[PDB]
Amino acid sequence: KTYGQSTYSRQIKQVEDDIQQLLKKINELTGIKESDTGLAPPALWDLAADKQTLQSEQPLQVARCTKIINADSEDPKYIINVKQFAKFVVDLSDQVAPTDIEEGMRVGVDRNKYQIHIPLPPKIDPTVTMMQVEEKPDVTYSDVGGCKEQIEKLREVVETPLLHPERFVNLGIEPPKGVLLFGPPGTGKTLCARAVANRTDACFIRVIGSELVQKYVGEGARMVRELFEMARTKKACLIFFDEIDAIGGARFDDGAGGDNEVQRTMLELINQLDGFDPRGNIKVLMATNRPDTLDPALMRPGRLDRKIEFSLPDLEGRTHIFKIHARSMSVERDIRFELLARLCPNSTGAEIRSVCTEAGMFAIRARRKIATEKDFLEAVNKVIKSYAKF
């Protein structure tokens, strides 16, 4: 056997093993043989063997998707274009009211007289619907420390104006609508963005700059245009471009053509942001390690109105970060976290989290279950000093 992990190890192992056996036994005693035809658990062929399927197949006919192209005369008469089938001039069934149908919206029509019965949501590139956040992160504004003025500005530009419009509307200030976050790698940009996404109360979209380069000409611009149309359907949304330097490259066309399609997509984003077509309720963020490369047209107010500098944290912020990350630990009681803050010279958040984890490591390798000071000193050594030359 082994050294002995815990007194109950064997007892829990036994209860798990017989749990597995009883689960297998019920599996055999209930059937549930995997079916290659995608068919539900027999206890879930429910309303399915009968009584809803047989009641849904009778009244619910098959409508066919069609894309309205024109709505001529006040009298209902609709030209729809069924995909790869035909193109017709049809009328409205009674269920839909005339106001519901507009030009350009997908509609459903029946298979006999092709009259309109239901609208439908527009078609969005599968690669442009996933950038919605769906499940929001849990990081919050207590997890970001040593950046207090920066977070204040970000919160006053992306967050406060949506929650309390009347403050700004009364005095008559249209709040800035863009932020450029720039600072050394690993200083707190993406984390503050995560926090903003968690706290905010409106649609959030994550776009990577490297996600807008495409093989076929004139696709990236379409992607940007669709993204902004989608974001404009919502009531209010935030878009957070990462590594925007990916496609905001400076314009240097000369001689043989080089990186020109990226330039067209960049111009399309520029025109979407601030341009003839009004930008509705949208707020934009960008993060870059290298803000200089961004072109003169993007970095201009009206598109990126604010510029927040993230600098390496000061000593107070250093200890604060140490303490935030050393929270869910099984750690000793008294650690002079000021000592640890001093002992690491200018170092970023990533340094500090690495310090915490390396201290946990040096605790484990010593077969200890509570982290002490010596663990943290060893951690700081192994992190700062040893990995200096990189």
Partner: protein, 393 residues
């Protein structure tokens, strides 16, 4: 099988024992009652004939369409093969866990209502990147590292073996390990070993294999590579010869280097970005590391960084006896005489010496390999050094 989570301390304890004993006892009551019912009545006939009703509802000429958007409410837009787009009703017997956009759905012929789904191929890229067992050898064939292998084991293997250790204290494992050192020193081999020894799906890629000749293909490749790694449970990725893709990132450059930088940004986001990386680890190798980008090898992206020195005096003996292991040698083999020289030999150099000696032994028909052959082979292999002798010294 969709069992309850104990969510006691999760570490061996009395509460984990009582929440565990309770589920066991309920399963016991259920099993007893079920066995009683089965003895009292088979129900085989009743469970049957439900298949018959289902197959009655789904007519014989079932049609394979292609789902394209689920309205979230037991409805769908299913596209027939030609290209038409219908708006059908999802019935009650389709296992909805298997319904996602792009799935080959099985529709009714007259009514196209969704009545099933089908499996798909498993090789978008899974086959081409997964390496299976390493043909070279297991941890046995590697010697002299000891400390490095220990680091890797703790970084990538130990968090899979016994999560309790890390979990007990509230610290997550390191994120990624970058293997750096002089060429021919045991990086790729150690990755191969920790691959063939662990229990996850290990994927390997060459950096020059991410340099694509159509725009926006490198970023797609990296995005996919990190896309079929969460589909597959715990997973490991090893991007070898990364130097060819991650470089200092000098801005005064023209050509396809911009695409290189753009794929580097995609990777830099995948490793640590907006979303949570799930359960995956990232190993990397680079013979030349001083030239990587600070944001790629920064702490939260790659916590562990491993140096790989050359064999010094004795690891040379170990490697030599490892590669000479399978060959009949004459009883005059002065191996130390070959090792004692401080010729800065590398591991791959040792393999080259072994193979060349074996090959000339084959050339001369001789049933055994002689020391003179090994020394001649050593001279021949070292002959591939060159350079300007007085210069620089």
């Amino acid at each position: 099988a969709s069992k309850l989570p104990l969510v006691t301390p999760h570490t061996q304890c009395r509460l984990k024992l009582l929440k565990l004993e309770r589920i066991k006892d309920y399963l016991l009551m259920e099993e007893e009652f079920i066995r009683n019912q089965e003895q009292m009545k088979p129900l085989e006939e009743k469970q049957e004939e439900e298949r018959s009703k289902v197959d009655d509802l789904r007519g014989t000429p079932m049609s394979v369409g292609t789902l394209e958007e689920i309205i979230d409410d037991n409805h769908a837009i299913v596209s027939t093969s030609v290209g038409s787009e219908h708006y059908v009703s999802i019935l009650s017997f389709v296992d909805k866990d298997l319904l996602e956009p792009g799935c080959s759905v099985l529709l009714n012929h007259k009514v196209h209502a969704v009545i099933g789904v089908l499996m798909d191929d498993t090789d978008p890229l899974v086959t081409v990147m997964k390496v299976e067992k390493a043909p070279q050898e297991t941890y046995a064939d590697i010697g002299g590292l000891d400390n490095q292998i220990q680091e890797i084991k703790e970084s990538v293997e130990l968090p899979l073996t016994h999560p309790e250790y890390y979990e007990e204290m509230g610290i997550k494992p390191p994120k990624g390990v970058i293997l750096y050192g002089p060429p021919g020193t045991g990086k790729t081999l150690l990755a191969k070993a920790v691959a063939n020894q662990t229990s996850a799906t290990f994927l390997r890629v060459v950096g020059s294999e991410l340099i694509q000749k159509y725009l926006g293909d490198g970023p797609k490749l990296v995005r996919e590579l990190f896309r079929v790694a969460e589909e597959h449970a715990p997973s490991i990725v090893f991007i070898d010869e990364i130097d060819a893709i991650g470089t200092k990132r000098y801005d005064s450059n023209s050509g396809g280097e911009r695409e290189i930088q753009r794929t580097m940004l995609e990777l830099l986001n995948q490793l640590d970005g907006f979303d949570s990386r799930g359960d995956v680890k990232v190993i990397m190798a680079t013979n030349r590391i001083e030239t990587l980008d600070p944001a790629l090898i920064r702490p939260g992206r790659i916590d562990r960084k491993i140096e790989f020195p050359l064999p010094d005096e004795k690891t040379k003996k170990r490697i030599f006896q490892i590669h000479t292991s399978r060959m009949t040698l004459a009883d005059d083999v002065t191996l130390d005489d070959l090792i004692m020289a401080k010729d800065d030999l590398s591991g791959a150099d040792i393999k080259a010496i072994c193979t060349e000696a074996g090959l000339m032994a084959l050339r001369e028909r001789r049933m055994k390999v002689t020391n003179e052959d090994f020394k001649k082979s050593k001279e021949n292999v070292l002959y591939k050094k060159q350079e300007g002798t007085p210069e620089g010294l």
